[PDB]
């Protein structure tokens, strides 16, 4: 048969980075797509997983194996062993600020590769329990991407889909 690659790429709304949605993809598969950097397999002709998230424009560099940053370490981590990204400025950027997308700024330990964390627990930095009250040494784990269409080229939102082939 053919592959529903058209239902992840051309999807209505992608999920936020921290809650990166994964879709399992029997078919053989042959836009601007700014970065079509591929690491896992050489570009030449059992299952594959499609991970779709929304990250800041410049953060596309962080979605690579052996890369160290907030996105990779905390939000979405890739194992050391293709990636497609397009700019969604006119699609996912509200003038008053599209705070719908969130990223994980505070985490005790780095994320395991392909691990997924949807926790909303207050980062307990100090030795006093935060009991659901944000204050000193008690900071919310997630921050909101300020997404305005008038943002710079870097800060414009870029829809990204990750393909992870599994034989």
């Amino acid at each position: 048969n053919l592959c529903p690659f058209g239902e992840v790429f051309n999807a209505t709304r992608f999920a936020s980075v921290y809650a990166w949605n994964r879709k399992r993809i029997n078919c053989v598969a042959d836009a601007s797509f700014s970065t079509f950097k591929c690491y896992g397999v050489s570009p030449t002709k059992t299952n594959v997983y499609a991970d779709s998230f929304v990250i800041r424009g410049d953060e596309v560099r962080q979605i690579a194996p052996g890369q160290t940053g907030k996105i990779a370490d905390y939000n979405y981590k890739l194992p050391d062993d293709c990636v497609i990204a397009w700019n969604s400025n006119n699609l996912d950027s509200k003038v008053g600020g599209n705070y719908n997308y969130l990223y994980r700024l505070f985490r005790k330990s780095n994320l395991k590769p392909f691990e997924r964390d949807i926790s909303t627990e207050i980062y307990q930095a100090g030795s006093t329990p935060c009991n659901g009250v944000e204050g000193f040494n008690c900071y919310f784990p997630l921050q909101s991407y300020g997404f305005q269409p008038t943002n710079g080229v870097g800060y414009q939102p870029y829809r990204v889909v990750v393909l992870s082939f599994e034989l």
């Epitope: 700024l105 505070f106 980062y123 930095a125 100090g126 030795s127 204050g135 000193f136 040494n137 921050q143």
Partner: antibody
Framework: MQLVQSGPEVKKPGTSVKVSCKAS????????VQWVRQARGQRLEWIGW????????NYAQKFQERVTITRDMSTSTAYMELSSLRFEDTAVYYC???????????????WGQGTMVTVSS | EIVLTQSPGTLSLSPGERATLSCRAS???????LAWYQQKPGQAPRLLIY???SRATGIPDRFSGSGSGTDFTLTISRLEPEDFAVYYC?????????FGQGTKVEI
């Protein structure tokens, strides 16, 4: 481990002064910088505090318009700028942060030397 | 707003005498967020007690902190020559964070 504040500052009324507090020795990421001002032989006054990691800022209503507290993780330096300087704003300004090496120590244990901003026509 | 009232204004005692300084608040403050600071003449403050009762690292054993709710007290059992300074009490629980007028330790 220490916090090193900026050198003494001499500014005119109506300008804006920026005092730099640079963190060294402790993991500045999960820390939080608090700015306190003290005039000669007078009680301490608290401007505001910033979560270094999140960047979220909370200001006392006194300096709401007049100050902006920022930080730069590349230089491990926190900044506090007081705008529309008045003669009465002349005082030493202190920078306080918690030694948050592993666990954040639950207390402002690091205080800077202070910066002396003198405002006069 | 939290009001931090310190008593007394000027406290004068001889070395080897117990110093009982008190810090009072308007509305109860979280006991985990009540610090005491020591201010030397022309020096940056150094935190004595954090958490209203836990002593800081590198602080002599003579300094001890107590109190909960609206009342907090700092106790110095063995006053020393270097122990003469002003003592400020700050709360970092509820916004805005406030500082006391400070109590002076004299001879």
């Amino acid at each position: 481990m220490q916090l090193v504040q900026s050198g003494p500052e001499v500014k005119k009324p109506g300008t804006s002064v920026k005092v730099s507090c640079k963190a060294s020795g402790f993991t500045f990421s999960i820390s939080a910088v608090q700015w306190v001002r003290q005039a000669r032989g007078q009680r301490l006054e608290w401007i505001g505090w910033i979560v270094v990691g999140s960047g979220n800022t909370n200001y006392a209503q006194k300096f709401q318009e007049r100050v902006t507290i920022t930080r730069d993780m590349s230089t491990s330096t926190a900044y506090m700028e007081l705008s529309s300087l008045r003669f009465e704003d002349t005082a030493v300004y202190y920078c306080a942060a918690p030694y948050c090496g592993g666990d954040c120590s639950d207390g402002f244990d690091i205080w800077g030397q202070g910066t002396m901003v003198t405002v006069s026509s | 707003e939290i009001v931090l009232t310190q008593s007394p204004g000027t406290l004068s005692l001889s070395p080897g005498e117990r110093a009982t300084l008190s810090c009072r608040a308007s509305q109860s403050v979280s006991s985990s967020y009540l610090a005491w600071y020591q201010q030397k003449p022309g020096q940056a403050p150094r935190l004595l007690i954090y958490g209203a009762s836990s002593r800081a690292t590198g602080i002599p054993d003579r300094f001890s902190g107590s109190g909960s709710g609206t009342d907090f007290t700092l106790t110095i059992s063995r006053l020393e020559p270097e122990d003469f300074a002003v003592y400020y009490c700050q709360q970092y629980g509820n916004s805005p964070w406030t500082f006391g007028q400070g109590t002076k330790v004299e001879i």
